[PDB]
Design a protein around this ligand. Structure first.
Ligand code: HEM
Ligand SMILES: CC(=O)N[C@@H]1[C@@H](O)[C@H](O)[C@@H](CO)O[C@H]1O
Ligand SMILES: CC(=O)N[C@@H]1[C@@H](O)[C@H](O)[C@@H](CO)O[C@H]1O
Ligand SMILES: CC(=O)N[C@@H]1[C@@H](O)[C@H](O)[C@@H](CO)O[C@H]1O
Ligand SMILES: *[C@@H]1O[C@H](CO)[C@@H](O)[C@H](O)[C@H]1NC(C)=O
Ligand SMILES: [Ca+2]
Length: 595
């Protein structure tokens, strides 16, 4: 028994139970427990942290200190030897649109962030990790292995800075290190509205009470809006093209301009807010700034939940779907809504669903222009290709008409992300998201692959032959064995993803367990789950049941041809239909039954 919460950042918790709306921070969702699921708290531990020194040192930190008697392979080496591949041909998912990937990142960003430590934004110390490759205090560089091509063109490591952790932050050493979650655990649309009341207000268009979200004043998208620019210099988005000089956007989530399609989806979501809001005033003139804001917010959340839970989850989890997430029975205030530390790694499967290129398509779903298809790496923190190069519409057409990468055991993560990732305050397009997941796994004190197979009630292979059988691959298992020398040491990110898919899923059984549990927990433990009676009306819930991503495009872009089932592989024109024939969101039940 160590205590009941460790809090020095528990920065004003006065509870109003009496609300028809969520807080911004997530506080006061569980009334019996007010801080459960709020942002700025520790990620839940489903299993105890496993650090090198028991407390907060990652496995791999001290050269001579092993895990279960072996050295841990270098993140980058696992990435070269197992994660890499060259041939992009035949890697596409024939049953998933590119929107299946992108929705995944939307939801992941609504659910969790564990951002790098904040005890250094303008010091030597920062560039000391990029420049000198010195394992330090929160600097934990990713070292290149003997044979690595990057040694020839980049230096000795990739810079990497340990995730933040709760309570102290300037010097710490007493209980087990627990990483923070800076977003709300609830599927709430916090990526559109922010998780802090500070940021939540800054994004609002206060200058008039129409419950509108603050839009971009310097540019437009033919009559349609953009997110406002974040004006913080220096700017990663300005850095990628000094001539076009377009900054990153300002969203309720800071990751929004990471890659162009993320920024597109975010863009659609704000347009829905405002659309929704305006349709409301054209119903209710009585309402003031808040009631319109909050009431569209509330609708934005439910749509997020319905799309994720009705359209998205069933094709991630497949046969395992109703096993982990059975039909809803209502809010269970005994359920734990917090995101587990492990989930923030399990949902990284999405990393293998990302293809090497992104296309703009025109009105006929043909190759927009002479640069239709762009390599993914040029789109990190790329906001200029939207504003100065077409709007979001051809990219959205892409999202429908194009396919996600299918995860593949001999072809795991495209080199766009594996060799050419762009990171802010780093000058080069040369990072490795895989190596970085793996460093991160260890950073976060993740129990290895068998602790999680155990936790999921699954077999624990102890030998190569064991692993071949589970992974159903003789080759991969062997390389995993050579690198790790016990399946107890396999990093959860790589072992869960190496597993073969379940029937009509896109993850293997261990991930479906980790994912399934977590999504069940975010539905059941949520007082404001759209389907929890008391949140909307019999009638309000009947309109909601009509919302489709297809519709969201229709009413928020100048696209007018869309498929029914946005998430599967859809080819023009045999799978498309007009905006016309697509059930819209009938907003009447939100008409004030008051004068
Ligand atoms: C090109 C598209 C994507 C890019 C560029 C990208 C990039 C990144 C980066 C830079 C990080 C932080 C890594 C670290 O420092 O630990 C990250 C983390 C993460 N990624 Fe992605 N990612 C992409 C797509 C996706 C998809 C499709 C999913 C899910 C389906 C996903 C899920 C996650 C999650 C859950 C985290 C951890 C978030 C946290 O809790 O801190 N990503 N990704
Ligand atoms: C041709 C084919 O197999 N298409 C499948 C479809 O059968 C399935 O119902 C859907 C998931 O809902 O995904 C895709
Ligand atoms: C290196 C690079 O991407 N340069 C581009 C340039 O091609 C483009 O015409 C201009 C548009 O504003 O923005 C910048
Ligand atoms: C009141 C009720 O039905 N509670 C259920 C019960 O299975 C369990 O005790 C708990 C954790 O799963 O919360 C839920
Ligand atoms: C908010 O909306 C009003 C009315 O549509 C508009 O005039 C104003 O420019 C908007 N403000 C911002 C900051 O987006
Ligand atoms: Ca959230």
């Amino acid at each position: 028994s160590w205590e009941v919460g460790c809090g020095a950042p528990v920065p004003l918790v006065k509870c109003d139970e009496n609300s028809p709306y969520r807080t911004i921070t997530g506080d006061c969702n569980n009334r019996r427990s007010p801080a459960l699921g709020a942002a700025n708290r520790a990620l839940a531990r489903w299993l105890p942290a496993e650090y090198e020194d028991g407390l907060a040192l990652p496995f791999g930190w001290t050269q001579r200190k092993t895990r279960n008697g072996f050295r841990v392979p270098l993140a980058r080496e696992v990435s070269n030897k197992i994660v890499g591949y060259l041939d992009e041909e035949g890697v596409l998912d024939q049953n998933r649109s590119l929107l299946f990937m992108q929705w995944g990142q939307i939801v992941d960003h609504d659910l969790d962030f564990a951002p790098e430590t904040e005890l250094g934004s303008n010091e030597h110390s920062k560039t000391q990790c990029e420049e000198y490759c010195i394992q330090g205090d929160n600097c934990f560089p990713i070292m290149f292995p003997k044979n690595d091509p990057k040694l020839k063109t980049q230096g000795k490591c990739m810079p990497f800075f340990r995730a933040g952790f709760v309570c102290p932050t300037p010097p710490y050493q007493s209980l087990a290190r627990e990483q923070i979650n800076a977003v709300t655990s609830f599927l709430d649309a916090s990526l559109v509205y922010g998780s802090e009341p500070s940021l939540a207000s800054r994004l609002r268009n206060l200058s008039s009470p129409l419950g509108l979200m603050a839009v971009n004043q310097e540019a437009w998208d033919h009559g349609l809006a953009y997110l406002p620019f974040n004006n913080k210099k220096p700017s990663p988005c300005e850095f990628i093209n000094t001539t076009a000089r377009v900054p990153c956007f300002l969203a309720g989530d800071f990751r929004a301009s990471e890659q162009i399609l993320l920024a597109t989806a975010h863009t659609l979501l704000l347009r829905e807010h405002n659309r929704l809001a305006r349709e409301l005033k054209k119903l209710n003139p009585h309402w003031n700034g808040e009631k319109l804001y909050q009431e569209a917010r509330k609708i934005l959340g439910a749509f997020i939940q319905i799309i994720t839970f009705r359209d998205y989850l069933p094709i991630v989890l497949g046969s395992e779907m109703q096993k982990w997430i059975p039909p809803y029975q209502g809010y269970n205030n005994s359920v734990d809504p917090r995101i587990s530390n492990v989930f923030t790694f399990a949902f990284r499967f999405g990393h293998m669903e990302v293809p090497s290129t992104v296309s703009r398509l025109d009105e006929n779903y043909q190759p927009w222009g002479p640069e239709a298809e762009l390599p993914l790496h040029t789109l990190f923190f790329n906001t200029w290709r939207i504003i100065k190069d077409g709007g979001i519409d051809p990219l959205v057409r892409g999202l429908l008409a194009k396919k996600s990468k299918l995860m593949n055991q001999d072809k795991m993560v495209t080199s766009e992300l594996r060799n050419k990732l762009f990171q802010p305050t780093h000058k080069i397009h040369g990072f490795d998201l895989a190596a970085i997941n793996l460093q991160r796994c260890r950073d976060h004190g993740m129990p290895g692959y068998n602790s999680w197979r155990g936790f999921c009630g699954l077999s624990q292979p102890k030998t190569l032959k064991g692993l071949q059988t589970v992974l159903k691959n003789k080759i991969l298992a062997k390389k995993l064995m050579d690198l790790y020398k016990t399946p107890d040491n396999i990093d959860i990110w790589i072992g869960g993803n190496a597993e073969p898919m379940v029937e009509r899923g896109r993850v293997g059984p261990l991930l479906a367990c980790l994912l399934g549990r977590q999504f069940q927990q975010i539905r059941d433990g949520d007082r404001f789950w759209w389907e929890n009676p008391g949140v909307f009306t019999e009638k309000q819930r009947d309109s909601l049941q009509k919302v489709s991503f297809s519709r969201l495009i229709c009413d928020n872009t100048h696209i007018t041809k869309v498929p029914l089932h946005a998430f599967q592989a859809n080819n023009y024109p045999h799978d498309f239909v007009d905006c016309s024939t697509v059930d819209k969101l009938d907003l009447s039940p939100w008409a004030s039954r008051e004068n």
